[PDB]
Amino acid sequence: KIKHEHIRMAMNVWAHPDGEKVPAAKITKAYFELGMTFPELYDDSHPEALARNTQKIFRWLDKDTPDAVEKMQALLPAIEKAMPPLLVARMRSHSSEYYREIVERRDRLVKDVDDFVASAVVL
Amino acid sequence: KIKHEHIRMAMNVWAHPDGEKVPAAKITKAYFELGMTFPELYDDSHPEALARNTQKIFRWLDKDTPDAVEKMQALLPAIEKAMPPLLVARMRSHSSEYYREIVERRDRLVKDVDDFVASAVVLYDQM
Amino acid sequence: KIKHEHIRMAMNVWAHPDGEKVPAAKITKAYFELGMTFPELYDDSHPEALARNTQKIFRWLDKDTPDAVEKMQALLPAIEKAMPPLLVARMRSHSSEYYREIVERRDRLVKDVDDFVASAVVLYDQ
Amino acid sequence: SKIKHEHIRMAMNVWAHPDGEKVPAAKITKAYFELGMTFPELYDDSHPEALARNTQKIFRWLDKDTPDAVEKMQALLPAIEKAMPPLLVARMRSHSSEYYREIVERRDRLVKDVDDFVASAVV
Ligand SMILES: [Cl-]
Ligand SMILES: [Cl-]
């Protein structure tokens, strides 16, 4: 139900501030916490797990083959546990009316903020 | 700039939670901090100063004579220095489009926040 | 779930602006709307129900006897149905990490909001 | 030249980003004539491709670094400020004015305040 493209969108927004290694690291940590096995991610005994897990995760995210689409679907439990809750909600907003409402409320509030700050501005 | 009638409104909202003695006291504190003398408000050397100041301030607030209006106008420096800044903006909103837009935009943001708190409470009780 | 003393805190803040009769009144409508029997509150047929109900509700809130806690625990469905939602969240925050966090972040945003207004009203002195 | 050319460009590009350059050009042109301005040259209400020609001119200067380009944008500032969204004006000026830096900082904190709040509600 969560379309491959929306995982990709949310994942890129998550990677933009500090790069993919941050999302990759947190996804892996939650992946092992959930005792998962598919898709394959290198545990910490590999000295280059992170660079490898990063390259992997974003190759699948950027491909549109059925194998890659499936692998990201399997990873959803780990992404959701690890993603910032506000970003999970955007990811979910295209398939869940609740979360769509959540982001609309978030968006409404910051528009409230911007209009407010602007009214204070002089010049 | 601030019409007498607008001090009255903001002053009544200020007094409703805890009474008039609270605004009067805060007004007096700023009155003296600002080294004022007109109109006259009693320092602590006069008996029942707060009660007498309170009765004074709010008598001027409810009357509409040029004297009542004049004394309230002299008091503005103390009132605004003493009042919650948000309340000053509400007071000024009837005479300044700047502040009207700010209070109006502030109120919408806070209502929109609190409504969301409401939606979360409902999520529980549903569940 | 809600400890008796925390119902009391929330109840007094509700009573602070306009008195005890206001919350009592809102509680009375919700108790009947919610069809309750314990505790006992006087219907509209008593000409001094509201005052007596007001004294009733707030005796239990101010007492700590085993009886009073039991009566106040039953009234919570009415209190929560009638109380300002923000105040229920404050009330629930003493027992719910969810609400502790929600209320906290709410209070910070609004405090930052009001502070901004303070800085603009000050800069008016220009 | 307190406001560096590069910051007018940054601020101008975000303004143009949602709906294109014609919106900023149009709103800027309106303020230019309202202010009875004459330098740099912007075509009055009467020329043919005025908006498109005005759009290209305004954004040619923004993208050049020559002395004439810098000066024409500096001269245009009074119109840009009358027309630009106030929140962006503060952003544009924040590197040269402590007031606007403070505005922009207070704003960004409020938006994080919001995001923390919605996140806390999301669970
Ligand atoms: Cl709307
Ligand atoms: Cl021509």
Author numbering:
A (entry chain A): 2 to 124
B (entry chain B): 2 to 128
C (entry chain D): 2 to 127
D (entry chain C): 1 to 123
Reported in the publication:
YdaT is a functional equivalent of the CII repressor in certain lambdoid phages and prophages. YdaT from the cryptic prophage CP-933P in the genome of Escherichia coli O157:H7 is functional as a DNA-binding protein and recognizes a 5′-TTGATTN6AATCAA-3′ inverted repeat. The DNA-binding domain is a helix–turn–helix (HTH)-containing POU domain and is followed by a long α-helix (α6) that forms an antiparallel four-helix bundle, creating a tetramer.
The final structure was built for residues Lys2–Leu124. The N-terminal His tag as well as the C-terminal residues Tyr125–His141 are disordered and do not provide interpretable electron density. The long C-terminal α-helix α6 serves as an oligomerization motif, with four such helices assembling into an antiparallel bundle, burying a total surface of around 2600 Å2. The loop Ser94–Tyr99 here serves as a hinge region.
